[PDB]
Structures are given as structure tokens and as C-alpha cells.
Amino acid sequence: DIHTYLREMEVKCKPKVGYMKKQPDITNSMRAILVDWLVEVGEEYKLQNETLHLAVNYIDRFLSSMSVLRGKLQLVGTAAMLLASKFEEIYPPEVAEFVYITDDTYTKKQVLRMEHLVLKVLAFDLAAPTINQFLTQYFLHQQPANCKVESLAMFLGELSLIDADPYLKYLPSVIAAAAFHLALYTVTGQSWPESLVQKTGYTLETLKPCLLDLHQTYLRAPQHAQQSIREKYKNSKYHGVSLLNPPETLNL
């Protein structure tokens, strides 16, 4: 079954939690700006949210293996989005486009070389379990489907990609669970489903650490330096869920 596969693969695909400490030229802050920029790119080329999740995973696994100078951080990101679009998108944009987006900071030959470097560093393994993949499984336990709850779970899931500290500490399934509960609670007043507790083995107790973090992030979102996700979720496509008021307390 797909769920068990995803649970095994996510552990195999997870980046090193404290990789940023070993990076001599880049910081979490730089990473936050980069991810925010990819969200902009995805918006512009109308890329799937899945591609965005995959790209972030590639970049974190890459930076978990190879040191990078800030001058090439953006190329790592562009290469990762290229790799993700080719792997996920039906009509992924061509190198030319990804070169264009960098405002010609890099040449096509430069993107091509990084593409081959990241790919090699990733052991040529691109199928990694993302937050969206788990959410897709969770959404099945959502008795009558609720789009707004779905769009809020997605919004929260995306915010997590911005901050390596503390999100690198959690597996995608955990973040997806916290994101789903929170979205459910904010929109319906309902909590993490028993069917899900049984299927995943996660309870609100085990989900508490990530939920407290995700709760703060959600509350602090309008003040966060990066604002591309909030802006993205303001549209009707996403039921303007970014404009909802987060729950004051969670009554855990």
C-alpha cells in the first residue's frame, strides 16, 4: 500500500536536520529567501505545488551533502526547480526559461552543469515523499470533502518550507498531519480524525510538538519577512484561506 511506501521513503529521503551549521557561506535566512523566490517562480510558470515541494527537498538534500557559496545558492535552486519540473510537470519549462527567471544571473550552460551536479548528489533519486503527498492520503478521511480546509492545509504546509529552523526536524507526514488538524480546527472546529489516528499511528499528543511550532508560524505569518505564500493563498483558487484568522488557542 502507498501509505507504508511513503512512510518508508520519507525517512530515506530526508535531509540532514542540522546541515546548515556545516555550511560556511550560507544561512537559514538565505534559504528562506530562495524558497520564497521559488514560490514566485511556480506561480509565474503555473507549476504544480508538488513541484515546489520536490524542489525544496532536492535543495535540502543537496545542501546536506555539498557546501555552496552564496553566489551559487540561486543556481542550486534553479537547478532543483528544473529537476522537479521535469520529474513532475507534463509541460515543464525549458532551461531557457529557468535562465530567464534568474534575470540572466546565470547562463544556460551553468544551469546544465548544476542540474547534472544536483542529480548526481541526489543519487539520481528524485521520487521523494512530500507534505502534499501525505495530505492527499489524509484528505480521503475528510468525510465530506471540504475545499477550504484543503487549501488551508496546503497553505500551512507551504509556510513550513520557508523555515528550515525548526521544520527540518519533522518528517513530511508529521507536518502534513499537523497542517491538516490545524486547518480542520480553524475552519470547522473539528480535530485530527480517528481514522487517521489509526491509519498513521499519530495522535494529537505525538503531533503536539510540530503543532505548537506550526501554530506560532501561522500566527506570525503576516509579520514574517517572506510573504509570497500568503499572497498566493489570498486568491479564489485557494479560497483566500491566507486571510482567515488563525485560532487563538488549540485546546490541546
Nearest-10 Cα torsion for 103, 163, 49, 195: 180
Both 155 and 93 in a single domain?
Answer: no
Q: Which domain holds residue 59?
A: 15-127
User: Could you tell me which of 157, 93, 161, 163 has the C-alpha nearest to residue 131?
Assistant: 157
Cβ distance 129 to 138 under 8 Å? Answer: no
CA distances from 234 to 23, 59, 240, 243, 248 (A): 35, 27, 4, 6, 21
Both 106 and 193 in a single domain?
Answer: no
Both 24 and 114 in a single domain?
Answer: yes
The approach used to solve this structure was X-ray
Domain count within the chain: 2
Distance CA 221, CA 223 (A): 5
For the record, the C-alpha cell of 131 comes out as 507534505
CA distances from 48 to 98, 128, 200 (A): 16, 15, 26
